Amino acid sequence: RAALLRPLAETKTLGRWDIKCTVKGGGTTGQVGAIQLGISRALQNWEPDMRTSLRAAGFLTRDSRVVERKKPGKAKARKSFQWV
RNA sequence: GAAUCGCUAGUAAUCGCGGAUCAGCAUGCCGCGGUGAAUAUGUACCCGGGCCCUGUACACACCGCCCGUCACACCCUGGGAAU
């Protein structure tokens, strides 16, 4: 909740807007991030003037750390068995 | 225990979920997603690889070649009393 309210604890006393939302897929941190960045998209009600206040702190871009798959042979994407 | 192994950001660690072969079956394997950091001093060190510059009796290429005593067999030869 604190995480999803930071996106508007700047240049907004919270007393100006309404958000009707929805989210699916993934997990507890995935969904919260998804909602956060959706708000970050739709903060374009004032289009050419809010990305000013936003990009500075970094409230615009996705976390492109999408999970790294499992390769063969190993037991994970970087873990490896033990040779002697 | 000595040691020794695995890893530099969605990774480590754990969380389960899903296949596989198959009537009967996974602590195994393959895949998928949840959550999720430590640390970047960098080539000093052991380590590993390359360069090129020197030295080599090595070329099966140093786990290489290789010397010497002793134990062993055959062969040849010297000294040697006395002849």
From Swiss-Prot:
Expressed in root tips, young leaves, flowers and siliques. Disruption phenotype: Aborted ovule development due to defects in fusion of polar nuclei and central cell maturation. This is Small ribosomal subunit protein uS9m. Interacts (via C terminus) with PIA2. Component of the mitochondrial ribosome small subunit. It comes from Arabidopsis thaliana (Mouse-ear cress). Belongs to the universal ribosomal protein uS9 family. Mitochondrial ribosomal protein required for central cell maturation. May work together with PIA2 in controlling female gametophyte development, possibly by regulating the expression of some mitochondrial proteins. The gene is RPS9M. Disulfide bonds: none annotated. It is found in: Mitochondrion.
